[PDB]
């Protein structure tokens, strides 16, 4: 019924099929589909996810208008993605006045001052990582980076969100470690999410059946655990994401007990695989380019002599490490996309955007577009050198998004990732094993993950 919207506005795009739109074009994934449409349609094109029209914009000025300028007025919320249950109070899922209240009451939790107080806690499990890394290195066999980084990210999440101190690699039995290990990213091209994308009318049916997109067993366990910790913390009468929220609940509007639980889980969901996935991507690019690995290891030793422990100020000093992280995020933006919902009829940069249309920014396509990048398929971390760090457009390179709805944990994630990278590199060096796919291929699903898990030879330095 709504498949003729983009034709009447003179907007190019793939011709849609009845009842499906262009979901069949997802056979290569969102990343490949967006890049092909960028080459075959220019700067602005459109497509349909079932009956939902999606407009893709690549003009940096338009991206600025959608994400920053007209964010509060028009482009405020993301598209609904399925039955959420009580998790509708999550900040990433909240909409309109609920989101603005929640972000205002949660912004101080991610301050630079509070982050400097969280560095020592994250540093403790960096030493835990190298201990398990040494045993894996002494074996003489290749090591999958997803598991060692997942154990590290899980350890950081448990100690930052709560007061739980666990070695996940050697103790995969605590209830925190078990349930949280199932908090993986959403494959939006799997049979379930594909079915709800074509059948959005089934989302309310799933909600009334108490069928939540998140595992119900994990959510109920975590909610009860917070209730146990909230009472136990009172009996003990701190640097915790929970404690910072508790210190805000007692002193816009207030924050509810169920809201605090919902935001606590979303932090785990936002950090478990995302941190580990980027860490695996970073180490793979260092192994195949040892010149970058050598210079980064030399820079780490210069700022931190004699294998010194990292500090908040020292992490921000290391420049080449920031270049490695940024360039890897350019090649692999694990979000792959940025989406906003147009809540009203509006014209942006001389273009009419009707209400209800989802506006999408192809982060992966822009990050590998030749117009803004030279040899985009190569791992050249020098693109972000201080002299060359200004030529890049901040709205073509959006790994953490932009505007008031960007990643609220960008500073925490960058510090957590960099703290791990300093410790592992100054003690270990990584070489490509035989099982490593030198031309590593990306998965064809809804996740920006490699086709095969990255395996790399590891040795003591």
Ligand X SMILES: O=C(Cc1ccccc1Cl)Nc1cc(C(F)(F)F)ccc1-n1ccnc1
**Residues annotated in the binding site for heme, as ranges?**
407
We find the least distance from the C-beta atom of residue 281 to ligand X, in angstroms, to be 12
The span from the CA of 47 to the CA of 55, in Å, is 7
* Contact by Cβ (8 Å): 239, 111: no
- Residue 413 found at the interface with ligand HEM (CB under 6 A): yes
- Residue 129: name the closest of 74, 170, 175, 82 by CA: 170
- Residue 419 found at the interface with ligand HEM (CB under 6 A): no
For residues 314 and 443, which CB has a smaller minimum distance to ligand X in the complex? Answer: 443
Stretch that binds ligand HEM, among 18-26, 118-126, 187-195, 272-280 (CB under 6 A): 272-280
- Secondary element (H or E) of residue 47: strand 44-49
* Contact by Cβ (8 Å): 357, 423: no
The span from the CA of 128 to the CA of 271, in Å, is 18
Q: Look at the alpha carbons of 371, 374, 380, 385 in this order and tell me if their dihedral is positive or negative.
A: negative
Starting at the edge strand found earlier in the chain, the sheet holding 338-342 runs 44-49, 52-57, 358-361, 338-342, 75-77
- Residues in touch with ligand X (CB under 6 A): 90, 92-93, 185, 266, 269-270, 274, 334-335, 407
* Contact by Cβ (8 Å): 240, 229: no
* Contact by Cβ (8 Å): 281, 332: yes
- Residue 455's beta-bridge partner residues? 144
For residues 92 and 437, which CB has a smaller minimum distance to ligand X in the complex? Answer: 92
133 binds, among ligand X, ligand HEM, none (CB under 5 to 8 A by kind): none
We find the least distance from the C-beta atom of residue 8 to ligand HEM, in angstroms, to be 29
We find the least distance from the C-beta atom of residue 63 to ligand X, in angstroms, to be 16
For residues 189 and 279, which CB has a smaller minimum distance to ligand HEM in the complex? Answer: 279
Stretch that binds ligand HEM, among 26-34, 187-195, 404-412, 422-430 (CB under 6 A): 404-412
- Residue 322: name the closest of 428, 429, 422 by CA: 422
- Residue 92 found at the interface with ligand HEM (CB under 6 A): yes
The span from the CA of 136 to the CA of 439, in Å, is 25
Stretch that binds ligand HEM, among 40-48, 122-130, 269-277, 379-387 (CB under 6 A): 269-277
- Residue 401 found at the interface with ligand HEM (CB under 6 A): yes
- Residue 293 found at the interface with ligand HEM (CB under 6 A): no
* Contact by Cβ (8 Å): 33, 364: no
Applying CB under 6 A, which of residues 152, 267, 373, 430 lies at the interface with ligand HEM?
267
- Residue 169 found at the interface with ligand HEM (CB under 6 A): no
Q: Look at the alpha carbons of 169, 185, 369, 439 in this order and tell me if their dihedral is positive or negative.
A: positive
- Residue 196 found at the interface with ligand HEM (CB under 6 A): no
- Residue 338 found at the interface with ligand HEM (CB under 6 A): yes
- Given the rule CB under 6 A, which residues bind ligand HEM? 91-92, 103, 267, 270-271, 274-275, 278, 334-335, 338, 399-402, 405-409, 412-413
């Amino acid at each position: 019924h709504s498949h003729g919207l983009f034709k009447k506005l003179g907007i190019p795009g793939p011709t849609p099929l009845p009842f499906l739109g262009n979901i069949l074009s997802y056979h290569k994934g969102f990343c490949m589909f967006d890049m092909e449409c960028h080459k075959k349609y220019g700067k602005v094109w459109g497509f349909y996810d079932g009956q939902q029209p999606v407009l893709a914009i690549t003009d940096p000025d338009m991206i600025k208008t959608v994400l920053v300028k007209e964010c509060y007025s028009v482009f405020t919320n993301r598209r609904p993605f399925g039955p959420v249950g009580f998790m509708k109070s999550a900040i990433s899922i909240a909409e309109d006045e609920e989101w603005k209240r929640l972000r205002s009451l949660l912004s101080p939790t991610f301050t630079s001052g509070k982050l400097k107080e969280m560095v020592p806690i994250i540093a403790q499990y960096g030493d835990v990582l190298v201990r398990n890394l040494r045993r894996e290195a002494e074996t003489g066999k290749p090591v999958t980076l997803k598991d060692v980084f997942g154990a590290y990210s899980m350890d950081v999440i448990t100690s930052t969100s709560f007061g739980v101190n666990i070695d996940s690699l050697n103790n995969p039995q605590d209830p925190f470690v078990e349930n949280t290990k199932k908090l993986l990213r959403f494959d939006f091209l799997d049979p379930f999410f594909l079915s709800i994308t074509v059948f959005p009318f089934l989302i309310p049916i799933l909600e009334v059946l108490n069928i939540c997109v998140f595992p119900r067993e994990v959510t109920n366990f975590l909610r009860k655990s917070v209730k146990r910790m909230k009472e136990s913390r009172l009996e003990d009468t701190r640097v915790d994401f929970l404690q910072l929220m508790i210190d805000s609940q007692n002193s816009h509007k207030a924050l509810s007990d169920l809201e605090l639980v919902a935001q606590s889980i979303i932090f785990i969901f936002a950090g478990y695989e995302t941190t580990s996935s980027v860490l695996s991507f970073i180490m793979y690019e260092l192994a195949t380019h040892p010149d970058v690995q050598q210079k980064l290891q030399e820079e780490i030793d210069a700022v931190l002599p004699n294998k010194a422990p990292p500090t908040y100020d020292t992490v921000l000093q290391m420049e080449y490490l920031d270049m490695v992280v940024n360039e890897t995020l350019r090649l692999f933006p694990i979000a792959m996309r940025l989406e906003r919902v147009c809540k009203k009829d509006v014209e942006i940069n001389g273009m009419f955007i009707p209400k209800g249309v989802v506006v999408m920014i192809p982060s992966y396509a822009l990050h590998r577009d030749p117009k803004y990048w030279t040899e985009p398929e190569k791992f050249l971390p020098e693109r972000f050198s201080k002299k060359n760090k200004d030529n890049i457009d901040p709205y073509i390179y959006t790994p953490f998004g932009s505007g008031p709805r960007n990643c609220i944990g960008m500073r925490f994630a960058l510090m957590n990732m960099k703290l791990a990278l300093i410790r592992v590199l100054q003690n270990f060096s990584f070489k490509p094993c035989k099982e490593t796919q030198i031309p590593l291929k990306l998965s064809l699903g809804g996740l920006l993950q490699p086709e095969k898990p990255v395996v790399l030879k590891v040795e003591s330095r």
